[PDB]
Design a protein around this ligand. Sequence first.
Ligand SMILES: N[C@@H](CC(=O)O)C(=O)O
Length: 299
Amino acid sequence: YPERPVNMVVPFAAGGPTDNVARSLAESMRPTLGETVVVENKGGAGGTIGTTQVARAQPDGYSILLMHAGFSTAPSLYKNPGYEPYTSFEPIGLVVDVPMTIIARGDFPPNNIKELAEYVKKNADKISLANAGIGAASHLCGTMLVEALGVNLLTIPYKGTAPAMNDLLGKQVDLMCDQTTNTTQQITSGKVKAYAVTSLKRVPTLPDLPTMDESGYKGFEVGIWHGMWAPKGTPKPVVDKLVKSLQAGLADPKFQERMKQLGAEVLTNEANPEALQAKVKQQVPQWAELFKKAGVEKQ
Ligand SMILES: N[C@@H](CC(=O)O)C(=O)O
């Protein structure tokens, strides 16, 4: 192992934030894996369809999952998300931690986060919020945003924030929370309005955006960690090979440069099964409590 290419499933549309991470990582893992990694995009239901696909795939090491913190929210959002977060997989390791930006279409009237809150409260019924479906990173942040503002908004789900971004750029949807691996490009060129970040400290590549925390939203912190998993029952030597390849992929300079430019923190020393298992163990109950408090129930 591996004696043929390894398929890496990204549960979202090509060209978006997780796809960007996946394609860079696929390249960086190659020298150590000793085979090419082929990215497959499988969007739908906030990432649960793609996650489920890998959960049900042959445990031979030729199907692996690259998925983000939505892996941990979906079990509190769906009566049956299609997988069991603690047992459906053999965890390989953590990958990156990506902050989010609150953005709007380029001609959205407010120019800052204070004015945004005021505008959304006053004009709520005229405003659409985009996300990548229940279970997505943009869904989690969007939920937190409308809760913090005390509003209910028309909410439009997409198979990823790549198609959502298309509509935002096209002025077909108004407001979105999305990861810097997808938004940096559009923010720095001035193509979208940018209001705030969801990190505890400012994003150094986007230094003029205040955190939500410093903007008055105490504890409004969202970091979209990403993990890599194989299906339950994948042989230990195969998991071992995947761990070694992931570690080498994260330690690679080209990968790290691209991640740095996109505002992603590389979790270089946390690319091991135990770290990912611990992350999932902590995160599922954390988001469960958040949704419970927001009155957001399983469906
Ligand atoms: N990470 C997703 C977007 C999201 O979950 O909000 C994507 O790659 O499209």
